[PDB]
């Protein structure tokens, strides 16, 4: 029964649903890349990396998480816009 | 009156023999399959058939393992150098490793490990 | 390249757990190396089967 | 084997083309059908 | 049977869990099969027991693929699609009706489900980190 592409897992989400302000959300769109298309406002983590299903989603979820508060955060190179 | 109602004794109120007895009551119920739906119960109950809705990894559970222990094997680069180029090329080996699909934590551990002894004879 | 975009860029290199320092692509080789992983026994059996008498 | 994988970081039917015919061309195959 | 029937029948055992289920936006079932007569039967047979099911199904049919190969002899595949989308269903409609079609799927009709599960925010996401 072990098909090897069933561990792939696709998270997608909004970004007017996070809550963000302008300088998050600008921040957001340029970690992320290709994965935020500007046309959807849709964000598209893919995760692929671990063996199982459950643990990808988990990684995806925690991706997810790790982004929001480093989006949200402003470091001293952040001031020299 | 019913038989249900009389005289009674009064006497009271309220290994391997267990095995075989146990394999001899189960022959009081032991009959012929009756038709197709039966033969697939009998065979997922025996575990030959596939559990549907199908689950492409059923049997499976990588040891239990978590996440974190795919991605993040950099604990396991504690006792090499920690500035040198074996620190580049450990660090990138084990991000190699992180992005294995196909390896178990256990796996992982042992190949850092031989990286580890085959550094330390040289 | 603007120094704010190298060092967003080795951000997300740390968020998403690709090589944060560029090591060129010439020592990225083992990344790849790592990033992935009987007649005999048809033989017997038919001569087993065929000396015992439910074989041809 | 792993080792030498090591030492190196350091540094569509399996059948003989007749015998496909033969199963392909009685039908053997499953959908491999001739253009 | 026209008088020798069963006296009762014992219905299996569906318990209602406390947990809260799965909700699924779209479950999209694209059957690849080599013989399009299969598929046209498996896409009867899976919409009306979609319908007596209760569930809303939609029906098309992708682009079929040809590989063609030389040995000249040349032989060939063909795969032809149809993609069932069903929408609206919670966590244990989608898994009975998939465990039936997919007890239900014929020869040579190879099966990819999609599921699209949705899910809330993260309580780590609502606010952020003070």
């Given amino acids: 029964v072990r098909n090897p592409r069933a561990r792939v897992v696709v998270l997608r989400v909004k970004l007017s649903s996070l809550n963000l302000d302008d300088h998050a959300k600008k921040k957001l769109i340029k970690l992320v890349g290709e994965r935020y298309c500007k046309t959807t406002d849709v964000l598209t983590i893919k995760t692929d990396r671990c063996p199982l299903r459950r643990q990808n989603y988990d990684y995806a979820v925690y991706l997810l998480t790790v982004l929001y508060h480093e989006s949200w955060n402003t470091e001293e190179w952040e001031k020299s816009k | 009156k ?121 | 390249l603007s120094e704010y975009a ?51 | 084997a792993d080792e030498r994988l090591r030492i190196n970081s350091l540094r569509r039917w399996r059948l003989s083309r007749i015998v496909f015919r033969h199963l392909a061309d009685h039908g053997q195959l499953s959908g491999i059908q001739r253009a | 049977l026209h008088v020798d029937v069963p006296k009762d029948l014992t219905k ?41 099911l209760g569930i809303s199904i939609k029906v098309h049919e992708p682009p079929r693929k040809i590989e063609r190969f030389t040995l000249r002899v040349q032989y060939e595949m063909r795969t032809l699609y149809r993609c069932l989308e069903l929408e609206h269903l919670t966590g244990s409609t989608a898994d009975v009706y998939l465990e039936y079609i997919q007890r239900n799927l014929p020869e040579g009709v190879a099966m990819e489900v999609t599921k699209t599960q949705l899910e809330q925010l993260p309580e780590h996401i609502k606010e952020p980190i003070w």
């Fill in chain 2, 2 to 122: 019913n038989i249900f109602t009389g005289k009674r004794l009064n006497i009271f109120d309220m290994s391997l023999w267990d095995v075989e007895f146990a394999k001899q009551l189960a022959t009081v119920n032991e009959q012929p399959l009756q038709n197709g739906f039966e033969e697939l119960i009998q065979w997922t109950k025996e575990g030959k058939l596939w559990e549907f809705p199908i689950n492409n990894e059923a049997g499976f559970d990588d040891d239990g393992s978590e996440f974190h222990e795919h991605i993040f094997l950099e604990k396991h680069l504690e006792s090499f150098p920690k500035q040198g180029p074996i620190r580049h090329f450990m660090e990138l080996v084990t991000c190699g490793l992180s992005k294995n699909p196909y390896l178990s934590v256990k796996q992982k551990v042992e190949h850092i490990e031989w990286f580890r002894n085959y550094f330390n004879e040289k």
């Fill in chain 3, 6 to 56: 190298f060092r967003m860029s080795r951000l997300s290199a740390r968020l998403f757990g690709e090589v944060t320092r560029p090591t060129n692509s010439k020592s990225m080789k083992v990344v790849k190396l790592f990033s992935e992983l009987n007649h005999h026994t048809y033989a017997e059996l038919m001569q087993t089967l065929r000396f015992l008498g439910l074989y041809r």
């Fill in chain 5, 12 to 52: 299996p055992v569906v318990t209602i869990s406390d947990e809260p289920d799965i909700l699924y936006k779209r479950l999209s079932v694209l059957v690849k099969g080599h013989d399009k007569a299969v598929l046209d039967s498996y896409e009867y047979f899976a919409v009306l027991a979609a319908k007596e």
